[PDB]
Design an enzyme around this catalytic site. Sequence first.
Site, PDB file in Angstrom:
ATOM      1  CB  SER A 172      -2.215  -9.005  -6.860  1.00 10.86           C
ATOM      2  OG  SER A 172      -0.887  -8.903  -6.372  1.00 10.86           O
ATOM      3  NE  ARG A 201       1.591  -2.715  -0.227  1.00 10.02           N
ATOM      4  CZ  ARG A 201       0.949  -3.383  -1.174  1.00 10.02           C
ATOM      5  NH1 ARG A 201       0.909  -4.707  -1.182  1.00 10.02           N
ATOM      6  NH2 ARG A 201       0.336  -2.709  -2.142  1.00 10.02           N
ATOM      7  CB  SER A 235      -1.547 -10.894  -2.981  1.00  9.99           C
ATOM      8  OG  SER A 235      -2.853 -10.370  -3.151  1.00  9.99           O
ATOM      9  CD1 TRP A 243      -3.688  -4.342   2.561  1.00  7.03           C
ATOM     10  CD2 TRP A 243      -3.425  -2.774   0.984  1.00  7.03           C
ATOM     11  NE1 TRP A 243      -4.188  -3.160   3.057  1.00  7.03           N
ATOM     12  CE2 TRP A 243      -4.035  -2.183   2.110  1.00  7.03           C
ATOM     13  CE3 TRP A 243      -3.150  -1.976  -0.131  1.00  7.03           C
ATOM     14  CZ2 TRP A 243      -4.381  -0.831   2.150  1.00  7.03           C
ATOM     15  CZ3 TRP A 243      -3.498  -0.634  -0.091  1.00  7.03           C
ATOM     16  CH2 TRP A 243      -4.105  -0.076   1.043  1.00  7.03           C
ATOM     17  CB  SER A 248       3.015  -6.513  -3.729  1.00  6.09           C
ATOM     18  OG  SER A 248       2.085  -6.691  -4.784  1.00  6.09           O
ATOM     19  CE  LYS A 289      -3.090 -13.473  -6.731  1.00  5.19           C
ATOM     20  NZ  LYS A 289      -3.549 -13.078  -5.371  1.00  5.19           N
TER      21      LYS A 289
END
Length: 237
Positions: free
Chosen positions: A87, A220, A40, A180, A178, A43
Amino acid sequence: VQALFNEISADAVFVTYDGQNIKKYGTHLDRAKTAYIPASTFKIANALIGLENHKATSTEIFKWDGKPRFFKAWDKDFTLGEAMQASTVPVYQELARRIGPSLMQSELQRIGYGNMQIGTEVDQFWLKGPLTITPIQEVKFVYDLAQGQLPFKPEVQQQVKEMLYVERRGENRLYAKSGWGMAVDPQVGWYVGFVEKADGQVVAFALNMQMKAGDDIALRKQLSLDVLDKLGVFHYL
Ligand SMILES: *C(=O)[C@@H]([C@@H]1N=C(C(=O)O)[C@@H](S[C@@H]2CN[C@H](C(=O)N(C)C)C2)[C@@H]1C)[C@@H](C)O
């Protein structure tokens, strides 16, 4: 700070960059030189490429088509900034398709992002390969964004910067993204951004750790803000 990392069974590294010196913390420092899929966090680059090439604006609303998405939280309309904090992959896959594989490939090579490989699929390359990037490349990429020093128009970098604005703490400002990556083995966790401190100094950072299905989503960001408090970069309010 070292006790904080191995309080978990977490295989992690935390990189900081001030524009002249890379600092490494955590349990697995070799992770900083290891390349991982951006997931992600791509982006940031997707939004930069899209705005610079006039494929979208920061005020355009990407409306939901009615088809259920991977998360129900994504079943609504988004601007690019709203989709950045959520996200929302389907909004940025639509952006990637507006860009096209050839322009996306040439732009990522122009800016030297990671290994500069996208393959054939313009809406999958950051989620399963072949695009990979090291945490050191990630801190330097978002540090350059903070300084307006990326090879993009100044107003483009400014727009994407505000898309990453997540917290004001007095005269300090946190910008973060963030990530994942769940479609790879092992799963990769990212937390990347920078703090604009009250004294004027910018400090970029990137958390990069191994993840598994049981992990809490908030771990995180918790870990990163914890370390940033301990480093003196971003003290708890
Ligand atoms: C990108 O790496 C993947 C996305 N990254 C996520 C993450 O970092 O949390 C999730 S978003 C998930 C649903 N929206 C929630 C959220 O961020 N808030 C409520 C603030 C969590 C997702 C796995 C993407 C490639 O799937």
